[PDB]
Structure 1
């Protein structure tokens, strides 16, 4: 990511990547509370293949996943988690702030009902998410940069540039040189 500024497109901010334009949603850059594209079909088709490949490799992964969540959905979920604001902020997006609202983010689930955390499966996603155009967004040890505690299961579709990204070991923030961190 060498080196472009973030542009406001109106409903969202984006940064121009090496091959694609990359929507930026985090604690610094919110989405328009209206922006409601639903699930991205191109990302979805890749997720399907990713899922199948994990199942083929022996992993107990569900066909089900958590993808598009609108602003309103995010509101319920964030509120529910307050029940403190402090602790919920560590791991749950405020509405307008979630990559899930872009329709480009997807949480992988085990056939046991839980978000994937099992170690071999987590490593497989670090190793191969990029083969399907995805990155593990909330990397371990990058909580300062991304704004969020690490998530083994949360995939963000970025396309072809995922392999160079994964190779860097960087957060998107660091790779494209935009701000993440805490709400301001």
Structure 2
């Protein structure tokens, strides 16, 4: 399968499910505002509960859906200032964040910070797929995904997550769609 332009977004047909694509190559449209995906949200709750039961200090609170308009403001504040290059490196241009899909969620520690502690991060690599999630921005896959590695950013893909995690690949590499940096 190859990506299809469906106007509001590009998507690719996975083994079980349609997979919406949002990255630095394929933006979502300005008007695409699906809010939080309920299926993803219900698995996230379970994921968090299982982390907490394994003893990790993980908050119930998370960063989920973020609209184009909110991302616009957020990206503008970052160029404002840390400059446009720090914005591109650490923020995301509006339309180009997976958070606008409603399928991406950042897990947060009860210490108030995005999860970076090594054992919790590896739990996510090992187990996020049990809840249909993948760790999107893998270590070492910056050229493929376009994004600096993030231990805490999870993307809901559903049943195919286990095969994806076992491959060690980015979604770009796994499904065969384009990634990389902003073309500009």
| C-alpha distance in structure 2 between counterparts of 1:91 and 1:167, whole Å | 28
| C-alpha distance in structure 1 between counterparts of 2:140 and 2:99, whole Å | 22
| C-alpha distance in structure 2 between counterparts of 1:44 and 1:128, whole Å | 16
Measured against aligned partners, the alpha-carbon deviations of 1:54-77 in whole angstroms (never above 9, x if no partner) come to 000000000000000000110111
**Which segment drifts farther, 80-89 or 153-162?**
80-89
Tell me how large the CA RMSD over aligned residues is. 0.6
1:21 aligns with 18
| C-alpha distance in structure 2 between counterparts of 1:115 and 1:88, whole Å | 18
Secondary structure of the residue aligned to 1:165 is: helix
- Which runs of 5 or more structure 1 residues have no equivalent in the other structure? none
Moved over 3 A (4+): none
Q: What TM-score comes out, normalization by structure 1 length?
A: 0.96
Aligned length: 180
Secondary structure of the residue aligned to 2:20 is: strand
Q: Offset at 1:99?
A: 0.7
- Which runs of 5 or more structure 2 residues have no equivalent in the other structure? none
Q: Offset at 1:119?
A: 0.4
Measured against aligned partners, the alpha-carbon deviations of 1:16-70 in whole angstroms (never above 9, x if no partner) come to 0010000000000010110001000000000000000000000000000000000
Q: What TM-score comes out, normalization by structure 2 length?
A: 0.96
